[PDB]
Amino acid sequence: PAHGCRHVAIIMDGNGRWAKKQGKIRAFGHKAGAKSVRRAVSFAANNGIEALTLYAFSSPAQEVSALMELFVWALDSEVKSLHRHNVRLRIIGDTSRFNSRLQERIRKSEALTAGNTGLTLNIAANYGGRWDIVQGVRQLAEKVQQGNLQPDQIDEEMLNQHVCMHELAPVDLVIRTGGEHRISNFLLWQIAYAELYFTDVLWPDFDEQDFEGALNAFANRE
Template sequence: MLEWARRRFAGSYERMLRREIGDSPAHVAIIQDGNRRYARKNGSDAPDGHREGAKTTERVLDWCDELGVEELTLYTFSTENFDRPEDQLESLFDLIESKLYEFADAERVHDGEVRISAIGEVDLLPDRVREAVEYAEGRTEAYDDFRLNIALAYGGRAELLGAARDVARAVERGDLSPDDIGVEEIDGRLYRQPARDVDLIIRTGGDERTSNFLPWHANGNEAAVYFCAPYWPEFSKADFLRGLRTYESREKSWQRTRSERAVALVRAVAETELAEAKTVGGRLREQLSSAGAREVSAELERQGESDVVD
């Protein structure tokens, strides 16, 4: 009876959270932390925690499909993870290898046209894991309805450092002028890339840090960040929905700030020339949400009325 009540309450709470969310973020990135601590809490070994975490990954894929998320990046294995004991590494590599083959052959992946990609220094991984990566990527390379990026041997600082060194070598060779170095030049020299910038980072396990994860694609896009306490194997749909709600709140706040700045700019320009204010206002309206555009239009009307009175 108690379990039935708990499930019913959880379902009601999820429905309430869902009603609070409008458009979902296009790209969610997750730091799957807490697998080993979950295992210790339950009297198990680390590999058991990682296996339970893999089940959560499958559930998250279902939630992304249901909620309209178009791209998911999972921080599966960092460059720092190479420092773990050999027995833990072998168990991790076993799990990563088997899951890549399993996902690559899964009906749900092909029915949903999911494209699997690995990002990171894949060449550092054992041959058997690299072969599994090639198999998964090859089996799904024609798809583009949903992107699943697996961050393997990934380190954000190393990624940016490698791109900077590549640019420096291109300048030294004379292939690139310093004046031509822009976002595109850096972007094209990163690891095999996600399709789009990150909108939301979720980290499980209680730590409030992003651990060198996707600094170019997340920080550069001012991604929202949601930290939560559950270990990755315990991560629930309600936790995921709360993360999406964090993104939505950030977006609304960001839109309000843009609207307020746009109105302030129109006022500043209107102090000197109303016609120019209308030109600037028209351009700003094209870049704002419908609510922000209405605010700018209202301000232009107020400025026009005050100009007539004057």
């Protein structure tokens, strides 16, 4: 609370570059990255942060189906730990085209942790900022079609109620590791007023001290 930062969003990037520098393969960077993910989640939960939203940045249509398989399979194991640390898990992104199986796992993972009182962790999977806005627009569009919503009655607050994470504290700080200075279609609507923090540190090397630096930079900025 001292940092006054309630919601932190992170574009994780640099795992491949990190591995390359050491003459190592992708698997090595991914392994290092997952470790950094756990470290960041634990840090947030132990530092009074209300919400952490993670986005794995990566530079096909057959590959995605395979990635989400890995995603969900990895999730099933992580959920136990998350639940154990009192974390509330939520998956944001277009999960509509996921097969009903791995789509039920996600659903159960969320149901299982919904009642926790610790950190709320949002993991982006097949997520897009524009997509997020659009799916929210379709919802309002349905209500227009059903006759109980006039086009001209639509305002910002209304649309805000239909975008991902509307129930949570607004995003206060966005962190992007890896050196690139862009949002890359991650959160858009939700970062209208967020502090943007760019660091050249590669995701695998981003540790607790780096996270603290970002929070300190945030606190001193206003």
